[PDB]
Design a protein around this motif. Structure first.
Motif, short mmCIF file in Angstrom:
data_model
loop_
_atom_site.label_atom_id
_atom_site.label_comp_id
_atom_site.label_asym_id
_atom_site.label_seq_id
_atom_site.Cartn_x
_atom_site.Cartn_y
_atom_site.Cartn_z
N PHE A 127 -1.02 1.74 1.22
CA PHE A 127 0.32 1.61 0.64
C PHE A 127 0.94 0.32 1.14
CE2 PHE A 127 2.01 6.20 -0.18
CZ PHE A 127 0.81 6.54 -0.81
N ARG A 128 0.76 0.06 2.44
CA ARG A 128 1.33 -1.13 3.07
C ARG A 128 0.71 -2.47 2.71
NH1 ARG A 128 0.96 2.12 8.59
NH2 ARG A 128 2.67 3.63 8.27
N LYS A 129 -0.35 -2.45 1.90
CA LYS A 129 -0.99 -3.69 1.46
C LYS A 129 -0.46 -4.13 0.10
CE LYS A 129 -5.25 -3.19 4.13
NZ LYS A 129 -6.73 -3.34 4.15
N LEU A 130 0.36 -3.29 -0.52
CA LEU A 130 0.97 -3.63 -1.79
C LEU A 130 1.98 -4.76 -1.57
CD1 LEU A 130 1.63 -0.04 -3.16
CD2 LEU A 130 0.07 -1.75 -4.19
N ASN A 131 2.40 -5.41 -2.65
CA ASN A 131 3.35 -6.53 -2.58
C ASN A 131 4.62 -6.23 -3.40
OD1 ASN A 131 1.18 -9.54 -2.76
ND2 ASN A 131 1.36 -7.91 -1.20
N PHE A 132 5.78 -6.68 -2.91
CA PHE A 132 7.07 -6.56 -3.62
C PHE A 132 7.10 -7.70 -4.65
CE2 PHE A 132 9.25 -4.97 0.46
CZ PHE A 132 9.60 -3.72 -0.04
N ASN A 133 6.46 -8.81 -4.29
CA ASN A 133 6.42 -9.99 -5.15
C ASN A 133 5.43 -9.88 -6.29
OD1 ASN A 133 4.65 -10.29 -2.59
ND2 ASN A 133 3.65 -11.56 -4.16
N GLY A 134 5.58 -10.77 -7.26
CA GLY A 134 4.66 -10.82 -8.39
C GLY A 134 3.48 -11.72 -8.06
N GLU A 135 2.44 -11.65 -8.88
CA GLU A 135 1.25 -12.46 -8.68
C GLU A 135 1.60 -13.94 -8.69
OE1 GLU A 135 -1.76 -11.80 -11.63
OE2 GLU A 135 -3.09 -13.33 -10.77
#
Ligand SMILES: NS(=O)(=O)c1ccc(CC[n+]2c(-c3ccccc3)cc(-c3ccccc3)cc2-c2ccccc2)cc1
Ligand SMILES: [Zn+2]
Length: 261
Positions: free
Chosen positions: A226-234
């Motif tokens: 879960f913690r490897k996800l990003n709030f930012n876009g690609e």
């Protein structure tokens, strides 16, 4: 919401939300701390009815502040009823809130205790026709909250964990059919309930909160993903999607009822 800029960072986090969403300082905001000694057993509460046998998931989406597993809610297939609710509420999506450390991450707390994460199964009152109309009503939504603690893995969650690689950044989605949400429920359905709100903007006061007392256990490796996800876009500077939880808000003039002795 094409102009919303709220988030969980230091400059657009929960303490800033009230500027664009004044209801943030309202009378029935969520989450809240559940004081187990003050919550009163309510013998008139009915057993909760969670009927997910026919649930039909469709997709999983990283929306920039969490990931949502969406369901086809065009028919009565996955419904929540009973408990403190009048009527039938249909499941539309579920998502989680989690921390950067196992010591925090949940939105509701229990005697100030913070869990590693919190699952929200969102349902809307069918008397209002659709989700958009339901959020404009005081009894428009029923959100089933389930705490996550780190220990043994939750088998039923692994399909979710494995697909996260494909939706790392904001705006990415992936087909996610045949996911059974019953695999995310604890054994007991004992719960606390109180009137509250959405915990992210627009923070509408349209939710009957039903928080289960029994947390589910997930493994360290599961929450680590879960913690490897990003709030930012690609293509943008990477900002890990962690600590996407709103802290406990004033209970004000509300009572939290317990379904159990
Ligand atoms: N934490 S909670 O109390 O269970 C809660 C439930 C529903 C909602 C509203 C659903 N929602 C989410 C949304 C919010 C949180 C989790 C998942 C989706 C995002 C956008 C969004 C906005 C801009 C860009 C991308 C996504 C919108 C909405 C939303 C608003 C009102 C009506 C319909 C949808 C808010 C909080
Ligand atoms: Zn939520």
């Amino acid at each position: 919401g094409m102009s919303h800029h709220w988030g969980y960072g230091k400059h657009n986090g929960p303490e800033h939300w009230h500027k664009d969403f004044p209801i943030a300082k309202g009378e029935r905001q969520s989450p809240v701390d559940i004081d187990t000694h003050t919550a009163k057993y309510d013998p008139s509460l009915k057993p909760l009815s969670v009927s997910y046998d026919q649930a039909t998931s469709l997709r999983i989406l990283n929306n920039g502040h969490a990931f949502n597993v969406e369901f086809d809610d065009s028919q009565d297939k996955a419904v929540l009823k009973g408990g403190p609710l009048d009527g039938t509420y249909r499941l539309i999506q579920f998502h989680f809130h989690w921390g950067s450390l196992d010591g925090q991450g949940s939105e509701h707390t229990v005697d100030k205790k913070k869990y590693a994460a919190e699952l929200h199964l969102v349902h809307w009152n069918t008397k209002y026709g659709d989700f958009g109309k339901a959020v404009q009503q005081p009894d428009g939504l029923a959100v089933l909250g389930i705490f996550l603690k780190v220990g043994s893995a939750k088998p039923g969650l692994q399909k979710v964990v494995d697909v996260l690689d494909s939706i790392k950044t904001k705006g990415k989605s992936a087909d996610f059919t045949n996911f059974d949400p019953r695999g995310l429920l604890p054994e007991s359905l004992d719960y606390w309930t109180y009137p509250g709100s959405l915990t992210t903007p627009p923070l509408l006061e349209c939710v009957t909160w039903i928080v289960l007392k029994e947390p589910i256990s997930v493994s360290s490796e599961q929450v680590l993903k879960f913690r490897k996800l990003n709030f930012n876009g690609e293509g943008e500077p990477e900002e890990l999607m962690v600590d996407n939880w709103r802290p406990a808000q004033p209970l004000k003039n509300r009572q939290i009822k317990a379904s159990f002795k």
